[PDB]
Design a protein around this ligand. Sequence first.
Ligand code: COA
Ligand code: COA
Lengths: 417, 417
Amino acid sequence: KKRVGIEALAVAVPSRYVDIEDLARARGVDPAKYTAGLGAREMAVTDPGEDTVALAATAAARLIRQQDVDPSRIGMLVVGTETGIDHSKPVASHVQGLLKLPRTMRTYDTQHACYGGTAGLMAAVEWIASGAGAGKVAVVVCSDIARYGLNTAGEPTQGGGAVALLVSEQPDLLAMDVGLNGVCSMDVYDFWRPVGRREALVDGHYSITCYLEALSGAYRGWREKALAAGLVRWSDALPGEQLARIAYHVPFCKMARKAHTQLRLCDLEDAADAAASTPESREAQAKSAASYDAQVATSLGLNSRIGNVYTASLYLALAGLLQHEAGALAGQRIGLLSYGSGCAAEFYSGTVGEKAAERMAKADLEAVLARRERVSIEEYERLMKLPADAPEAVAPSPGAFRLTEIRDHRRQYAEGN
Amino acid sequence: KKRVGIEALAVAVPSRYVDIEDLARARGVDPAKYTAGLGAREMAVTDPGEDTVALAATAAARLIRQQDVDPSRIGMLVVGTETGIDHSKPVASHVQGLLKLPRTMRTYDTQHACYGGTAGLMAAVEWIASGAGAGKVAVVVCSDIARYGLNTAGEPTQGGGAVALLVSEQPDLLAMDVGLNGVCSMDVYDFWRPVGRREALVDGHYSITCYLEALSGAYRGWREKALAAGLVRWSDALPGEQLARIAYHVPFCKMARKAHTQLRLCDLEDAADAAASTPESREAQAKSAASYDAQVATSLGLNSRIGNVYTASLYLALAGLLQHEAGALAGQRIGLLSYGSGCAAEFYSGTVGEKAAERMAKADLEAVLARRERVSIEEYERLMKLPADAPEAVAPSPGAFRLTEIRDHRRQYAEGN
Ligand SMILES: CC(C)(COP(=O)(O)OP(=O)(O)OC[C@H]1O[C@@H](n2cnc3c(N)ncnc32)[C@H](O)[C@@H]1OP(=O)(O)O)[C@@H](O)C(=O)NCCC(=O)NCCS
Ligand SMILES: CC(C)(COP(=O)(O)OP(=O)(O)OC[C@H]1O[C@@H](n2cnc3c(N)ncnc32)[C@H](O)[C@@H]1OP(=O)(O)O)[C@@H](O)C(=O)NCCC(=O)NCCS
C-alpha cells in the first residue's frame, strides 16, 4: 500500500572534538563520572564558522549528493533547531540559498528545544500523507550546537552537528505508522536559553524527571493506539518488547538506559496483573540488561562520539542503529522517543525498509566521523571564548560550508572545494 | 465529503495605539504619506508586558472561550512568530501552561518571518488531512510585535497583536483546497533581525520587489493546479477573477493594491493572447479599481487600525473580510497570499462555510478593537525605550495575560480578573 516516512539520512559534524577524559581532568572531575556515569567518549567542539547554518547546509548537501536527490522534487525544507541565528530569517532559507535549491518549496524552521526536528518531520510526513506532497519529497534538517559553558554542570554533555532527513513516499529507512503517535507536553522550566544568552540554563536533574514523565505519557499514548491497531498485544511479552528496537533522545548516552527502564516500567505498572508485583520486582524486571542489549544498546555509537546535538540526538541514534543493523531490521517495526525541554515528548513507530541498508551504506557515516581532528581542552576553551561573529580562518572540507564573516549584519558563507 | 481548514478565529491587540497622523507630525513627515501613501490609520504600540506570549495566550484563550472549544480535543498547539522570546522554549509551551491546557498535544513554534503562521497552519491542516488528526483540532496562533525603531523608515508600519486559528474537520470559516497550494521561496536579505537586536533591519523597497516576485511564483503555482482541478478556467474572465475575494499579507494597507495588481498582471502576461497586448494596456487592466473593490478592498479594516503584525497580518485581513461578508461568501471560493521576508510566499484557496458568519459573530471583533486606548507619541516613545524585562505596572483585562516580571531568568505572567 502507500507508505510515508524517512527515505535516507546524512550527518554533518564539527571538524574538532575533545576526549571527554581530558575534560574531566581539566575540571578536577573523576573521568569515570563522564565515561561510566554519562556514557560519553568524545565531545564535538566548534568554532564560530561552524554555525547552525553551516552544519545544516553541510548535512543537507551531503544528503542530496549521497542519495542523488533531484533538488526540484523538494517541496518542503524545514530546519528543526534551538540554535537559531535570526529572529526572522530562518536557517532553512540560508540552507536553500547555499545549496542553490529551486523555488517551489516551503521553507521554515521549527522550534521546541530538542523536539523541533521531530515536529518538522511530522509536518513533512503529514504533508505527504495528506496527498499534498504526493510525488514530492521533503528535507528536514536537525541542526544544533549545545553550549552550557565552561565549568558548568552541563558542559560534559555539549556537542554539535546536524542530521538531514529525506522524507518521501519511498521511506526506505522508516515507513512511519501515521496517526499512531503518542504525545505528552507541559509547560516547564527544565532547560531554556533566553534571547541573546549564548549558554543554556538548566536544572539537570529536574530535566531528567521531566524527560521520563513526558516519555511515559507519550509512550502510553502510542501503546494504546498500537494495541487497537493490532501491532502489539498484552501477551507473555510486554507490549514494548514487541518492538524490535527502540531509539531514544540521547542528551547523554546513559539517558537511554534510564529511558528504556522507564518505558518498561510503564508496561509493568499498567499490566492487568500489576497488583501481583512489587516496586522492587517491577524495577528489577524493567532494568533487564537483556532487554536493553536487545533493543537499545547498539543505537549509541555515534552519540557517544559527538555529544548532545539537541534536535538531532534521536536521529543520530537512529542513524547509528541502522548503520549496522538495517538489513537485519528490514520488515521489523521499531519505536522512537523524541523529547524536548520546555517540554514535549512524542513516541512513534515505523517499519524499516528492505532498502534501508543500501541507503545507510550511501551515508558513509564512518567517513564522516573519521574526518574530524582532536584538540586540547585549552584550544576548546579558546574557541569557546570567540564571539559568534569571529569564525576561524579555516577552509571548509569539500562540499561543506562555513560562516566566514558577518558584514553589514549579513552572514557570509563559503563552500569547500 | 471530508473537509479541513479554519473553523474559527480570535484576535488580541495591545491595549494602546497611536494615531498615525500624530506620528507623522512628530517625525516632520506629511501625514498624507502615511494615510494615503501607506493606508494607515492607527498603529498599535506596546509595553513590555504585552510580549509575544501574553498576546498569543490572550488570543488563544479568547478563541477557546468564544467558540466553546473542548481543550482536551486540541492535538496540536503551534505558534507562528518572528518575535520569539527564548532560543529553546517555544511560545507555544508558555501558552499551553497559561491556558492550563492538557498534555496530549504537540507544541512548537514555526519561524519564517511573516510566513511562520501559514507554515504552522499547513502543518495542522495536513496533520488532520493525513488522518493523524482525525477527531481532534489544532490551535495555530500568529503572534508578533513589529518593531523598526524611532525615526526609521519602517516605523509607521509597526504594530502588534495575535490571531488564534481553530483548525479542524469542521472548517466553518475556510475549507481549504488541500494540495493545491502554490509556493515560491528564495534566500534573500530583504528584512531580518539578528539575535538580540530588538529592531529589524530592512531594505523596504527591495522587500516590496521580493514580495511581488514571490507572490507571482506562488500564485502561478496555485493557478496551474486550480486549472487542472477545474476550479478556474481561462475564459472571458481571468483565472484570478473567478475567486470571490483575495486576501493578502498586509505589511501596510496599500500593499494589498500592489499585490492585487501584480496577481492580475500574472494572468494578463500568461494568457495565450498576451502577445496582442502592451505593458501599458496590461497595467491599466491589472490596476482595475473595479476588481480591487470587488475582491480586496473590504479586507483591510482591522489592519489599518493595528499595523503590521507580521505572521498575523494575512489572518487579520481574512478576519476583517469575514467579519462583514461571511454570509455572502458562504459556498464561495476565496484566495489567500502569505508572504514572509527571507523569503517565502504561499498562495492557497478555500471555500467559506455556511456557518462562517456564526463563528465570526462569536469572535466579537469590534469589542476587541474598542477596548484599546489612544496614547501620545511621547508616551509611545517612553514605552519603546523600556527594556524588554520592564513591564508596566498595569493589570490585564479580564481573561487576558501580561508578562509581569522576569525573576531568575524565568518569565512570570498574570491573568486578568
Ligand atoms: C546530566 C547532568 C545532570 C549530570 O549532572 P551532575 O549532577 O553533574 O552528575 P550526577 O551527579 O548526576 O552524576 C551522573 C552519574 O554519574 C555517576 N558517577 C559519578 N561519579 C562517578 C564515578 N566516579 N564513577 C562512576 N560513576 C559515577 C553518578 O552516580 C550518576 O549516576 P546515575 O546516573 O546513576 O545517577 C548534567 O551534566 C546536566 O545538567 N546536563 C545538562 C542537561 C541534561 O542533559 N539533562 C538530561 C535531561 S534528559
Ligand atoms: C513601506 C516603506 C518602504 C515606505 O518607505 P518610504 O521609503 O519611507 O516611503 P515611500 O517613499 O515609498 O512612499 C510611500 C508611498 O507614499 C507616497 N507618498 C509620499 N508622500 C505622500 C503624500 N504627501 N501624499 C500622498 N502620497 C504620498 C509615495 O509616493 C509612495 O507611493 P507608492 O506606493 O505609490 O510608491 C517603509 O515604511 C518600510 O521599509 N517599511 C518596512 C518594510 C515593509 O513593510 N515593506 C513592505 C514589503 S512588502
